[PDB]
Design a protein around this ligand. Structure first.
Ligand SMILES: [Zn+2]
Lengths: 325, 61, 178, 135, 189
């Protein structure tokens, strides 16, 4: 029972479920959540710290770069993987695990990658969200040793190599359903769904591809056989000359170009929380907007705001009196 | 009818000259009615009050 | 058990998809209601269950999700869940004044102002939230606050400059015993 | 007095909630709609023309009309929300929302919510001039 | 056992009001031989509540200008008042003192809320420490007002005002001032 940081973020109190609890210092000390550090001094102390061996982290990296997941992995992640590897090797016999895993099998469909399947509240033609089910919706929930990993990359490598891992649910998991980003220029796959530029060739070219991994160790990934996904419509447009200074915003063509620092003030990024015990004493129902600061005059916006505006093609026609920032 | 009270949390200072304290009040009638009131003078966390009337609620929203 | 269904437009599908968990978590935890999103009819459907705590919470949920769909932020309709006396007046810009074409667009501009600042200024004086659909204006707040915001907006789209609007709305807020 | 219906089945009424820009109207009728059971205006509760369109007046109207339906035996109501419509504003105001919330509060089952305002195909000329309306 | 001036018991006293029980501190540990202490009580916030209430009464009746430094004189006046209270009523002077302080303290105060120009006051609740302070201040003010130009003596005046305030009759200055303050607080709303 090797606990990853995902169980600690989700308040997964599975300490009574297992007995061989082993954790890393750098998977518990980096968490900036206050409630986790609060409950850490409250939770019963039967977890213990263990260090992996350099040979086993070397082997774990050796087949993890054959799985095609090594750029997506992190150092403490490899610590967790090789810790579980060492525990299952030292307790259980080593003949269960298999190395140099299976090949991929390609089977595409007509469905869009943005089809809203496997969302709990979404239902095509009954799927309801009940307070009996709010504790149930975590993931695709299906003996002695296991993992408490929430990342798909960890589940992927642990299941390709062959360990039975589990979730916040007490029962061991069977299938892994998720999405990955694949470059369609260099054909390199990254398990990090947040990024937009690929690590290999750096173009803004990652696209979603669905991946399902069975309990045997066989993986199959579905592409989308849809002409809308691979369409060069809104891609070539005339670019402005690069401007410098403290105020210039650039069209963001590379993943690591140096942008000028344009942050928001504290009052500008306060969101009203309504379930605070002292919210009712507020003279206004809402947090007051910020108009006085210099960031308000410069029309500085959050990264989240204006997402569908970027998805419009620049070679189009907007409204006559509107200006796009 | 006169009801006893309790101070749960001091919230802030209100009034024109900052003379009043906005505070939260817990009841000693074994009820969990935490009502926000305005008091005059020095109050700290744990004080006990005497309300002439309880049906009035202070300036909320 | 009874239910309410509310529709969603095409442009409001993605904000519903992104903020979905922040929508259905207070509906199912504090109110105790079943919720789903019918994709064929494109309707958010909320029904009462056996473990619903009290009546009129379904109407709170309907107001919450409808306010989110109209364009308000998820916190601003969580305010509708918690508070009691909050309402939604909405009206067309061409209602008070017959405007055609470009003039109408300029009216929209002086509801926003530069950078939206004028709009935010009203949100500081009337203590309300305001959402601009393409020809429509939605106000969320208390009744006298909604009326104050509506007078300010109608003063803006009859030609009055923002300075007179700020002065008048601040005077009215001063006489409003706030 | 009332229908001879068992406790399992419920009877239906249609509650025309008409929230004009001066008061509110609560016109509870049969499913046919021809004959009125009750109608509580804003002006029947508050003795002030300033408070005529207040949500408090609509709340009192909804409470009184729900009491009237409980005295007769109407237990579930369909709702036809209405604004002034026509040339004027088409969207129902805060009074209609307050009346519906107060009527749902007082133990009454809600059936179908229907936004029936007299939306013109093509309007006649507006009440104001070319200058405008509402200050 | 500690006795006030070596004569007055401190274990017989009972506090009627729950609100003033924690601030009227005379009962067990705070009993002193002399009201005079010359110890700091205004150094930090809420420290004067720890101070014995007889010392508060002593410090609050030399407040007027021509007697602004004399404190042995003040505890002598308190002694004469306590003697004549004993020989009038028969109860312990600390008991009737506690009763007078409890029944003299206001419960609601009108307060100016708004701006300069709006004279409409709002009624707000009263702190228990401020209630104790105002009760002692009103008792001392009645002691001054009853002893200005007469044969009737200041310690005797404090005794009479204290008894009138404790039995609740409309003869103490504190009682009538508190009653008019309460009725205007009710009338404000
Ligand atoms: Zn690439």
């Amino acid at each position: 029972v090797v606990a990853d940081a995902g169980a600690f973020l989700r308040h997964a109190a599975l300490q009574d479920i297992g007995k061989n609890i082993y954790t890393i210092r750098e998977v518990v000390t980096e968490i900036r959540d206050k409630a986790t550090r609060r409950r850490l001094a409250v939770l019963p102390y039967e977890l213990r710290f263990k260090e992996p061996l350099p040979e086993y982290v070397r082997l774990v990296t050796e087949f993890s770069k054959k799985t095609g997941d090594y750029p997506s992995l992190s150092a403490t992640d490899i610590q967790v993987l090789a810790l579980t590897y060492q525990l299952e090797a030292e307790f259980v016999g080593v003949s269960h695990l298999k190395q140099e895993p299976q090949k991929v099998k390609v089977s595409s469909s007509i469905q869009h990658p943005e089809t809203p399947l496997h969302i709990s509240g979404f239902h095509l033609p009954g799927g309801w969200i009940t307070p009996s089910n709010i504790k149930q919706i975590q993931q695709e929930l299906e003996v002695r040793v296991g993992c408490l990993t929430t990342d798909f990359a960890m589940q992927n490598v642990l299941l390709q190599m062959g360990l039975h891992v589990l979730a916040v649910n007490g029962m061991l998991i069977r299938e892994a359903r998720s999405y990955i980003l694949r470059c369609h220029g260099c054909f390199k796959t990254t398990s990090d769904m947040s990024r937009v530029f690929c690590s290999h060739c750096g173009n803004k070219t990652l696209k979603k591809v669905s991946v399902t991994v069975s309990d045997d160790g066989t993986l199959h990934m579905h592409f989308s056989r849809n002409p809308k996904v691979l369409n060069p419509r809104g891609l070539r447009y005339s670019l402005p000359t690069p401007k410098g200074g403290k105020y210039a915003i650039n069209p963001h063509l590379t993943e690591d170009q140096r942008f000028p620092q344009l942050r928001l003030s504290q009052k500008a990024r306060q969101k009203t929380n309504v379930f605070a015990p002292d919210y009712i004493a507020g003279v206004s129902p809402f947090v007051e907007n910020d108009i006085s600061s210099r960031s308000a005059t410069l029309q500085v916006r959050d990264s989240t705001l204006g997402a569908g505006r970027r998805r419009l093609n620049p070679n189009a026609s907007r409204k006559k009196f509107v200006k796009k920032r | 009818p006169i009801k006893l009270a309790r101070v749960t949390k001091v919230l802030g200072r209100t009034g024109s000259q900052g003379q009043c304290t906005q505070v939260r009040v817990e009841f000693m009638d074994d009820t969990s009615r935490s009502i926000i009131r305005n008091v005059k003078g020095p109050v700290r966390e744990g004080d006990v009050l005497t309300l002439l009337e309880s049906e009035r609620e202070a300036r909320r929203l | 058990e009874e239910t309410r269904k509310i529709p969603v437009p095409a442009n409001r599908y993605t904000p519903l998809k992104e903020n979905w968990m922040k929508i259905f978590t207070p509906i199912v935890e504090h109110l105790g209601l079943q919720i789903r999103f019918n994709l064929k009819s494109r309707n958010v459907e909320i029904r009462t269950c056996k473990e619903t705590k009290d009546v009129s919470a379904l109407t709170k949920a309907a107001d919450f999700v409808k306010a989110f769909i109209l364009g308000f932020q998820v916190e601003d309709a969580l305010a509708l869940i918690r508070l009691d006396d909050l309402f939604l007046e909405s009206f067309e810009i061409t209602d008070v004044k017959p405007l055609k074409g470009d003039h109408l667009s300029r009216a929209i501009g002086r509801i926003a102002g530069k950078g939206g600042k004028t709009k935010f200024t009203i949100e500081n004086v009337t203590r309300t939230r305001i959402v601009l659909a393409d020809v429509k204006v939605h106000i969320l707040g208390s009744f006298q606050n909604i009326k104050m915001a509506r007078t300010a907006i109608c003063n803006l789209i009859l030609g009055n400059p923002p300075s007179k609007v700020y002065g008048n709305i601040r005077a009215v807020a001063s006489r409003s015993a706030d | 007095l009332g229908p001879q219906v068992a406790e399992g089945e419920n009877v239906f009424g249609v509650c025309h909630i008409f929230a004009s820009f001066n008061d509110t109207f609560v016109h509870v009728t049969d499913l046919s709609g021809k004959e009125t059971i009750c109608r509580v205006t804003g002006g029947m509760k508050v003795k002030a023309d300033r408070d005529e369109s207040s949500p408090y007046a609509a709340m009192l109207a909804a409470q009184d009309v729900a009491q009237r339906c409980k005295e007769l035996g109407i237990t579930a109501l369909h709702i036809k929300l209405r604004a002034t419509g026509g040339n004027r504003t088409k969207t129902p105001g805060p009074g209609a929302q307050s009346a519906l919330r107060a009527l749902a509060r007082s133990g009454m089952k809600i059936g179908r919510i229907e936004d029936v305002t007299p939306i013109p195909s093509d309007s006649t000329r507006r009440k104001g001039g070319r200058r405008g309306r509402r200050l | 056992d500690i006795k006030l001036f070596g004569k007055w018991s401190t274990d017989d006293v009972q506090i009627n009001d729950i609100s003033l029980q924690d601030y009227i501190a005379v009962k067990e540990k705070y009993a002193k031989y002399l009201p005079h202490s010359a110890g700091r009580y205004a150094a930090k916030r809420f420290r004067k509540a720890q101070c014995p209430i007889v010392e508060r009464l002593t410090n609050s009746m030399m407040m007027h200008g021509r007697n602004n430094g004399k404190k042995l004189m003040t505890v002598r006046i308190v002694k004469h008042a306590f003697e004549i209270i004993h020989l009038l009523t028969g109860e312990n002077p600390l008991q009737v003192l506690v009763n007078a302080i409890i029944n003299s303290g206001p419960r609601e105060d009108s307060t100016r809320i708004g701006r300069a120009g709006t004279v409409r006051r709002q009624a707000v609740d009263v702190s228990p420490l401020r209630r104790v302070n105002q009760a002692i201040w009103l008792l001392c003010t009645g002691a001054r007002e009853a002893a200005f130009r007469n044969i009737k003596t200041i310690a005797e005046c404090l005794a009479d005002e204290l008894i009138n305030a404790a039995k609740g009759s409309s003869n103490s200055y504190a009682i009538k001032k508190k009653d008019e303050l309460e009725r205007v607080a009710k009338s404000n709303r």
